[PDB]
DNA sequence: CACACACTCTCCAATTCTCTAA
């Protein structure tokens, strides 16, 4: 510790706003790099230098005020890349035991401190200036001296963008400048964003395509494409009025719930006694039920009034969504909208072609196709949002991208089912693949709507290819029949249901418009026998699982759920599959909802199926027993 | 039954045909026009 | 001690389905246009039967357990028997 | 002293994971 303190002191000192470097900075920095290279597996030197805050106190001032001293600048850049190395790379994984996890948290804390320090525009200004005067030279004029410096500069930017938000300070409310927002603003004011656009659009500097893709991914980490595309000049009044209206809506909901609870309990204090015998209700024994919880509770009596819920065991605990969404700063949102627009118009086709070339040549790291699929989803969604132009994404519209995404999704599906010790990670990768697939399937619909007969022709071509090949049809059933709430989040379930709805919409409209009978060595096909594959218990079980959150679901998601269930019930006559006790409890909640008028479609469907059930029950009383279990072909025996 | 063959081969043509699009990549320009 | 379980053999075919066959012999449903209150009556009767069967759990926990029990030999054999005669 | 509370540890068995047959 003390030897590190000595070298850290030997770096120099700050005075007011000017840093006075010692002449032995070079050897002291080399010694620091040597200590970091000879670290323990606990990363003790990492923790100690982070605690000493030399990155904030010495290296940033040296970088910002002595950037003409090129050997010292290069040494400082290498040292800063080493220090800003992400914790997952430092330790290899998230440790499973307390001591290494404490060390991981320490390194992560100091990384968050570095990210806080790096929001200064001066540092990114120096980085942009040195990268600019480097890239001014021709590619053939570069040597290892400059190519390695480009690598270290871009890796420093990547490392600083990668850092997770502190759990302490991630409680920022919407429309506020988080640390990531301030960092993006630093990039914007320094002009490194324009250098990233240049690197993406350059044919000569295509060697950095994977790096630039990772920078752009970490830049647009938090954003949503349609929400970002909706940003514009008049947003302040819109968002202010929306905030006031949403505040009043929340308040009215809370007042309604308070009034309902005040009615459920009486207007007498709890120690006001009184006991009743409910003569008809047998207790757990043969004696009549004695009720003690007040007369007010017997209007909506239930036996679970006083019961403690059960501990879901660790294995059965459902997966939860990893982050809340927050509306970032308006300046940063405008900057990211402009970045995304200019990038889409000037850079996107060449960058995606370069990344696909890298993946084909197999000179990319293990999971860089996840970044490729992210970029597909984000930028095609942004393109369709606002002024849709398929020329801006025509490199992505090929059937080869459908094939690549389908292969990746099936690979992630297999690896999720087999590599069980990181099944959640494989599920997240599969979620990225699913969103990319969804955006392709949405883009062909937008091509159909668009007026150009050329894009309509190619839309017909790709639709014919996809609906002809079997895997695109079978993948949805494959996903539904092995989806697990234990592993995959409800956001994934939402995306799967909406993608299935869109896919069946397109397929039904296609077959309705024209026959096109042969499919898959070909065989005949029809959409009704395809839909009969969705009559399995598991898929409808997943659909009602998503339906349980109808209060929190989006209106489009609720429409997708109810339309699929209405297709299975009304058009395929499979109401006995959906005659279930848990589903009936959900219908009971739907009918008892005070906001049931807001869910007119759902309650109407519920009353339709309930009326069918009670007709069957009046005809035959064994339907009550049939409610208790999921079923296979009892769906026809009941009929 | 030959309508089945006609449909199959016409669909084969309609999937083997190339993807005509308004593909375009805009003007190349040096880093000065980007940065400043 | 004999800690109880909601399993396939203690009670589900002993105080469970055989009684559930009889629970709705005296029910009072009124049909189309009254599905809401018909469902409320149905849920109350099902909840009461489940409580008298296994009183340790809440109703939805009981449902999520019994749906898993629907895969077991005794349960489906009793289900087919109840479908057929008695 | 001694009779109730408050807290920890251990064992037991009930549930879920894995591999196999109907």
């Amino acid at each position: 510790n003390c030897e590190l303190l000595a070298t850290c002191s030997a770096l120099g000192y700050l005075e007011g706003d000017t840093y006075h470097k010692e002449p032995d900075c070079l050897e002291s920095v080399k010694d620091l790099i040597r200590y970091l290279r000879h670290e323990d597996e606990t990363r003790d030197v990492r923790q100690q230098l982070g605690a000493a805050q030399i990155l904030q106190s010495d290296l940033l001032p040296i970088l910002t005020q002595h950037h003409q001293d090129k050997p010292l600048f290069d040494a400082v850049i290498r040292l800063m890349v080493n220090l800003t190395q992400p914790a997952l790379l430092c330790f290899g994984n998230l440790p499973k035991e307390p001591s290494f996890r404490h060390h991981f948290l320490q390194v992560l804390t100091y990384l968050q401190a570095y990210k806080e320090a790096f929001a200064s525009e001066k540092a990114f200004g120096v980085l942009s200036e040195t990268l600019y005067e480097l890239l001014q030279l021709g590619w053939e004029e570069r040597q290892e001296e400059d190519n390695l410096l480009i690598e270290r500069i871009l890796l420093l930017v990547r490392n600083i963008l990668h850092v997770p938000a502190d759990l302490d300070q991630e409680k920022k409310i919407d429309d506020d400048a988080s640390a990531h927002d301030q960092l993006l603003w630093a990039i914007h004011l320094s002009g490194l964003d324009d250098l990233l656009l240049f690197l993406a659009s350059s044919s000569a500097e295509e060697q950095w395509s994977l790096h630039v893709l990772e920078i752009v991914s970490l830049m647009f980490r938090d954003q949503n494409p349609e929400q970002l595309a909706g940003v514009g000049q008049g947003r302040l009044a819109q968002e202010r009025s929306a905030d006031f209206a949403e505040l009043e809506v929340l308040r009215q909901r809370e007042m309604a719930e308070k009034k309902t609870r005040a009615l459920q309990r009486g207007n007498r204090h709890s120690r006001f006694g009184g006991s009743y015998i409910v003569q008809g209700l047998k207790s757990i024994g043969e004696r009549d039920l004695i009720f003690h919880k007040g007369l007010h509770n017997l209007r909506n009596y239930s036996s679970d009034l006083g019961k403690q819920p059960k501990k879901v065991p660790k294995r059965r605990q459902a997966a939860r969504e990893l982050s809340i969404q927050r509306r970032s700063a308006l300046n940063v949102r405008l900057f990211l909208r402009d970045f995304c627009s200019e990038f889409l118009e000037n850079c996107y086709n060449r960058l995606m072609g370069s990344v696909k070339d890298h993946l084909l040549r197999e000179k990319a790291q293990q999971h860089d196709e996840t970044y490729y699929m992210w970029a597909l989803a984000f930028f095609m969604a942004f393109n369709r949002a606002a002024s849709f132009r398929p020329g801006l994404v025509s490199e992505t519209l090929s059937v080869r991208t459908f094939h690549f995404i389908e292969q990746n999704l099936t690979n992630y599906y297999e690896m999720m089912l087999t590599d069980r010790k990181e099944a959640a990670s494989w599920a997240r990768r599969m979620h990225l693949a699913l969103k990319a697939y969804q955006e392709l399937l949405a883009t062909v619909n937008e091509m159909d709507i668009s007026p150009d007969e050329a894009v309509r022709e190619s839309s017909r071509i790709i639709k014919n290819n996809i609906f002809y090949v079997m895997e695109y049809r079978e993948l949805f059933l494959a996903l539904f029949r092995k989806f697990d709430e234990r592993c995959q989040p409800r956001s994934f379930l939402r995306d799967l249901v909406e993608t299935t709805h869109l896919f069946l919409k397109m397929l039904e409209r296609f077959c309705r418009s024209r026959g096109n009978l042969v499919v898959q060595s070909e065989k005949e096909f029809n959409f009704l026998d395809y839909l009969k594959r969705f009559a399995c218990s598991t898929v409808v079980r997943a659909y009602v699982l998503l339906l349980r959150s109808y209060q929190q679901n989006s209106a489009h998601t609720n429409h997708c759920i109810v339309k699929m269930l209405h297709r299975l019930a009304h058009d395929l006559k499979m109401e006995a599959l959906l005659f279930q006790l848990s589903v009936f409890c959900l219908f009971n909640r739907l009918l008892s909802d005070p906001a049931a008028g807001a869910y007119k479609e759902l309650v109407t469907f519920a009353k339709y199926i309930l009326g069918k059930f009670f007709a069957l029950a009046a005809v035959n009383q064994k339907a009550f027993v049939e409610l208790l279990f999921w079923k296979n072909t009892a769906v026809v025996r009941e009929m | 039954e030959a309508l089945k063959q006609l449909h199959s081969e016409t669909q084969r043509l309609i999937r083997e045909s190339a993807l005509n699009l308004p593909y375009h990549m805009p003007e190349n320009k040096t880093i000065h026009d980007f940065f400043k | 001690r004999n800690i109880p379980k909601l399993d396939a053999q203690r009670l589900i075919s002993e105080r469970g389905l055989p009684a559930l066959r009889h629970v709705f012999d005296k029910a009072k449903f009124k049909g189309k246009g009254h599905e809401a209150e018909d469902l409320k009556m149905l849920i109350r009767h099902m909840e009461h039967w489940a409580h008298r069967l296994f009183p340790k759990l809440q109703f939805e926990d009981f449902i999520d357990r019994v749906e898993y029990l629907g895969s077991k030999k005794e349960v489906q054999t009793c289900l087919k028997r109840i479908r057929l005669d008695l």
Side-chain angles (χ1 to χ4, degrees), chain A residues 1-311 313-639, chain B, chain C:
Chain A
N1 199 331
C2 52
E3 76 295 30
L4 278 309
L5 208 179
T7 48
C8 292
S9 307
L11 262 299
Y13 62 98
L14 186 66
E15 171 160 313
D17 60 354
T18 301
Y19 192 84
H20 297 86
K21 64 181 178 95
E22 307 294 357
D24 57 313
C25 269
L26 286 296
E27 52 262 45
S28 54
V29 167
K30 258 104 174 184
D31 292 338
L32 288 170
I33 292 163
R34 280 187 271 270
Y35 287 120
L36 284 166
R37 289 279 173 81
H38 296 299
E39 266 170 353
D40 191 4
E41 187 163 17
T42 62
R43 303 296 182 177
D44 58 336
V45 180
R46 220 156 287 270
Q47 296 178 45
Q48 282 164 3
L49 297 178
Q53 302 196 7
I54 55 152
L55 194 137
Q56 304 88 319
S57 307
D58 300 324
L59 281 48
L60 261 302
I62 292 157
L63 179 146
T64 51
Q65 302 187 352
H66 299 277
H67 56 276
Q68 298 87 348
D69 193 356
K70 306 300 182 66
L72 180 59
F73 185 85
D74 171 84
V76 165
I77 285 290
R78 284 184 284 114
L79 174 54
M80 286 180 76
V81 167
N82 196 330
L83 279 168
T84 58
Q85 186 172 353
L88 287 165
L89 295 184
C90 288
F91 291 85
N93 51 49
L94 273 157
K96 291 190 292 188
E97 64 92 20
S99 301
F100 267 146
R101 186 69 76 104
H102 161 56
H103 299 320
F104 180 92
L105 291 160
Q106 282 285 300
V107 175
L108 178 55
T109 301
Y110 302 133
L111 283 161
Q112 280 148 206
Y114 303 155
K115 198 193 200 172
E116 286 278 28
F118 240 101
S120 180
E121 189 271 337
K122 303 295 187 179
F124 278 94
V126 163
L127 292 165
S128 66
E129 284 288 351
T130 191
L131 196 108
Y132 168 80
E133 62 96 344
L134 195 165
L135 293 171
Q136 269 297 153
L137 308 179
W139 175 89
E140 70 284 4
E141 314 191 71
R142 307 190 215 295
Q143 302 184 10
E144 296 181 25
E145 181 173 27
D146 293 329
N147 286 330
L148 187 57
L149 182 52
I150 289 292
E151 274 203 47
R152 294 302 189 233
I153 292 284
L154 292 178
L155 284 168
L156 183 61
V157 176
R158 197 283 310 278
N159 285 2
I160 292 296
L161 279 165
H162 180 265
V163 180
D166 187 3
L167 77 94
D168 308 348
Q169 294 180 355
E170 66 179 3
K171 71 185 290 182
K172 306 213 83 190
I173 312 310
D174 57 8
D175 219 316
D176 193 354
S178 63
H180 195 81
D181 299 338
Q182 295 169 38
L183 182 62
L184 293 168
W185 197 242
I187 287 160
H188 164 69
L189 296 178
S190 64
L192 182 63
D193 56 330
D194 300 334
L195 298 173
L196 288 158
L197 269 81
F198 166 77
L199 285 163
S201 54
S202 178
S203 59
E205 295 295 340
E206 180 265 11
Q207 54 179 346
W208 317 118
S209 51
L210 297 173
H211 296 79
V212 171
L213 184 72
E214 190 166 39
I215 302 306
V216 171
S217 177
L218 298 168
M219 278 182 71
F220 290 92
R221 187 157 69 177
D222 299 358
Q223 271 56 54
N224 170 278
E226 284 85 346
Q227 294 173 9
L228 184 63
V231 175
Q233 301 297 112
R235 288 291 299 173
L236 281 165
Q238 295 179 3
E239 293 179 357
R240 181 62 55 73
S241 55
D243 290 331
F244 283 122
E246 182 167 37
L247 174 61
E248 262 292 321
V249 166
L250 292 157
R251 291 251 294 152
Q252 293 295 324
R253 193 188 299 150
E254 286 184 351
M255 288 168 178
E257 282 186 346
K258 188 173 182 179
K259 289 296 299 186
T260 53
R261 279 184 273 112
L263 292 172
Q264 183 61 22
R265 68 179 145 273
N267 59 349
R268 304 282 177 174
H269 69 289
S270 67
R271 292 189 194 79
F272 199 95
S275 312
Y276 310 90
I277 300 159
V278 181
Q279 295 186 125
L281 287 177
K282 299 179 73 169
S283 63
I284 60 166
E286 72 281 22
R287 300 176 67 75
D288 300 353
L289 182 72
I290 304 173
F291 198 80
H292 302 97
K293 299 182 171 70
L295 182 59
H296 44 83
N297 274 303
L298 286 164
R299 303 189 303 263
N300 287 318
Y301 174 74
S302 62
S303 298
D304 58 0
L305 277 158
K307 290 182 181 176
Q308 293 281 17
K310 76 179 187 186
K311 174 73 175 66
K314 185 275 300 170
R315 292 180 181 172
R316 305 309 191 82
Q317 290 173 198
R320 280 172 283 149
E321 287 73 32
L322 289 306
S323 184
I324 194 68
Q325 313 306 333
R326 52 169 287 280
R327 208 170 61 205
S328 58
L330 182 57
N331 302 89
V332 173
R333 281 188 286 156
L334 285 155
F335 153 68
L336 289 171
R337 188 206 66 173
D338 296 357
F339 189 105
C340 194
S341 163
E342 276 70 315
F343 174 90
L344 183 67
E345 286 181 354
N346 293 274
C347 313
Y348 183 62
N349 279 316
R350 199 191 301 285
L351 190 73
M352 295 297 277
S354 302
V355 173
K356 184 57 171 166
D357 293 335
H358 276 72
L359 268 290
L360 255 59
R361 294 162 73 175
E362 201 182 333
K363 43 164 64 186
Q365 294 191 11
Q366 189 172 347
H367 306 289
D368 290 338
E369 75 289 358
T370 63
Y371 295 122
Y372 185 77
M373 283 176 284
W374 171 88
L376 284 172
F378 197 97
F379 292 107
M380 296 186 75
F382 190 93
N383 184 24
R384 296 179 311 91
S387 56
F388 175 65
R389 304 186 207 120
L392 277 43
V393 299
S394 286
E395 282 288 0
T396 69
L397 299 173
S398 174
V399 299
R400 189 173 62 165
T401 63
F402 289 83
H403 186 273
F404 185 56
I405 296 154
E406 180 263 305
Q407 284 286 358
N408 294 332
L409 212 161
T410 52
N411 173 42
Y412 299 151
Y413 150 86
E414 295 154 21
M415 292 294 290
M416 191 231 298
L417 292 165
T418 52
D419 187 8
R420 301 179 194 129
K421 302 302 300 188
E422 59 171 66
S425 297
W426 287 112
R428 284 184 284 275
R429 297 174 194 132
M430 200 177 74
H431 192 184
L432 291 172
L434 177 59
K435 284 186 283 187
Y437 184 25
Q438 182 180 353
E439 282 301 330
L440 293 186
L441 299 166
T443 306
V444 309
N445 288 279
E446 199 68 23
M447 290 164 71
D448 291 357
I449 298 297
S450 71
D452 190 5
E453 293 84 354
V455 310
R456 289 177 178 187
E457 181 65 25
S458 46
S459 179
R460 196 261 276 99
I461 293 167
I462 62 190
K463 279 190 293 188
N464 275 252
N465 203 295
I466 268 56
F467 302 142
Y468 166 69
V469 176
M470 70 178 288
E471 287 84 339
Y472 303 108
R473 299 196 311 284
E474 300 294 333
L475 183 55
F476 294 94
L477 292 309
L479 290 173
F480 276 114
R481 288 183 292 92
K482 290 191 170 181
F483 159 82
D484 200 346
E485 178 72 342
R486 170 181 63 79
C487 179
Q488 287 142 293
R490 184 163 58 75
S491 56
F492 173 83
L493 183 57
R494 176 204 68 197
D495 292 0
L496 176 57
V497 162
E498 291 190 340
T499 310
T500 306
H501 173 272
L502 186 135
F503 187 80
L504 268 301
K505 172 65 75 172
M506 288 196 301
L507 183 134
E508 290 284 334
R509 194 248 297 185
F510 180 77
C511 296
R512 173 257 172 168
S513 175
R514 289 185 185 172
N516 282 330
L517 304 174
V518 306
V519 168
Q520 195 184 0
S521 303
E522 304 92 320
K523 60 181 291 302
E524 295 83 352
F525 171 84
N526 79 77
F527 51 85
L528 299 172
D529 75 77
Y530 178 60
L531 280 169
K532 282 175 180 178
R533 300 180 55 72
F534 291 85
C536 193
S537 61
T538 58
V539 54
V540 60
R541 186 167 174 175
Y543 267 84
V544 297
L545 180 67
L546 189 67
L547 187 64
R548 284 177 195 173
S549 60
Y550 72 98
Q551 205 74 244
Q552 308 91 321
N553 289 344
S554 81
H556 179 266
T557 310
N558 284 344
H559 186 243
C560 285
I561 299 157
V562 75
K563 178 57 178 178
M564 185 64 175
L565 298 176
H566 184 271
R567 199 189 298 277
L568 264 288
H570 184 273
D571 301 353
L572 279 84
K573 273 66 176 181
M574 299 298 287
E575 287 91 334
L577 188 74
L578 191 55
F579 291 169
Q580 285 291 280
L581 184 55
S582 49
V583 178
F584 276 24
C585 288
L586 179 51
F587 292 163
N588 183 31
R589 281 186 260 284
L590 262 161
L591 273 298
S592 306
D593 198 315
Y599 306 106
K600 182 65 176 188
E601 308 303 333
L602 275 57
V603 295
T604 46
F605 173 77
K607 286 202 291 189
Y608 165 81
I609 184 160
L610 287 163
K612 291 288 183 180
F613 175 74
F614 288 118
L616 176 60
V619 170
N620 170 29
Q621 48 70 29
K622 295 177 287 198
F624 299 116
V625 170
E626 296 294 349
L627 284 180
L628 196 62
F629 308 109
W630 295 101
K631 59 198 78 179
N632 305 339
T633 77
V635 183
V636 304
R637 162 61 175 82
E638 291 187 46
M639 304 308 91
Chain B
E1 200 174 19
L3 300 172
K4 186 180 183 182
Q5 185 68 7
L6 293 183
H7 282 302
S8 63
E9 303 317 297
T10 48
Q11 286 204 260
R12 273 178 169 275
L13 290 172
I14 265 58
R15 69 179 67 117
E16 293 296 331
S17 47
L19 299 176
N20 186 10
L21 289 161
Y23 183 105
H24 65 85
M25 290 190 286
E27 292 195 328
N28 56 306
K29 45 182 183 182
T30 48
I31 195 172
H32 334 296
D33 302 351
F34 278 90
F35 192 51
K36 286 176 185 177
Chain C
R1 188 172 65 174
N2 298 78
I3 301 296
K5 318 97 172 183
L6 171 51
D7 60 351
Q9 55 86 44
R10 188 216 170 196
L11 72 183
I12 186 160
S13 48
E14 290 73 29
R15 206 189 217 192
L17 283 309
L20 181 57
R21 164 59 189 83
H22 292 160
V23 157
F24 296 96
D25 290 336
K26 294 179 178 179
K28 310 174 73 172
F29 307 104
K30 52 167 68 62
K32 187 179 286 187
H34 313 269
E35 293 84 355
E37 61 177 68
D38 289 358
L39 178 57
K40 294 282 281 188
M41 188 183 292
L42 170 57
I43 290 290
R44 277 200 294 269
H45 280 78
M46 292 302 304
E47 189 198 298
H48 184 229
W49 163 79
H51 175 228
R52 298 191 75 263
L53 185 63
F54 200 60
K56 194 172 185 291
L57 298 172
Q58 291 193 354
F59 186 41
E60 279 86 343
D61 302 337
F62 172 90
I63 291 160
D64 296 355
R65 173 57 172 235
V66 85
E67 283 178 8
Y68 166 75
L69 292 180
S71 64
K72 304 305 294 290
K73 273 277 185 288
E74 302 94 329
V75 180
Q76 51 243 22
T77 49
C78 286
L79 182 60
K80 276 188 287 184
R81 181 167 178 165
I82 287 160
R83 270 199 285 269
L84 262 54
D85 41 1
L86 73 170

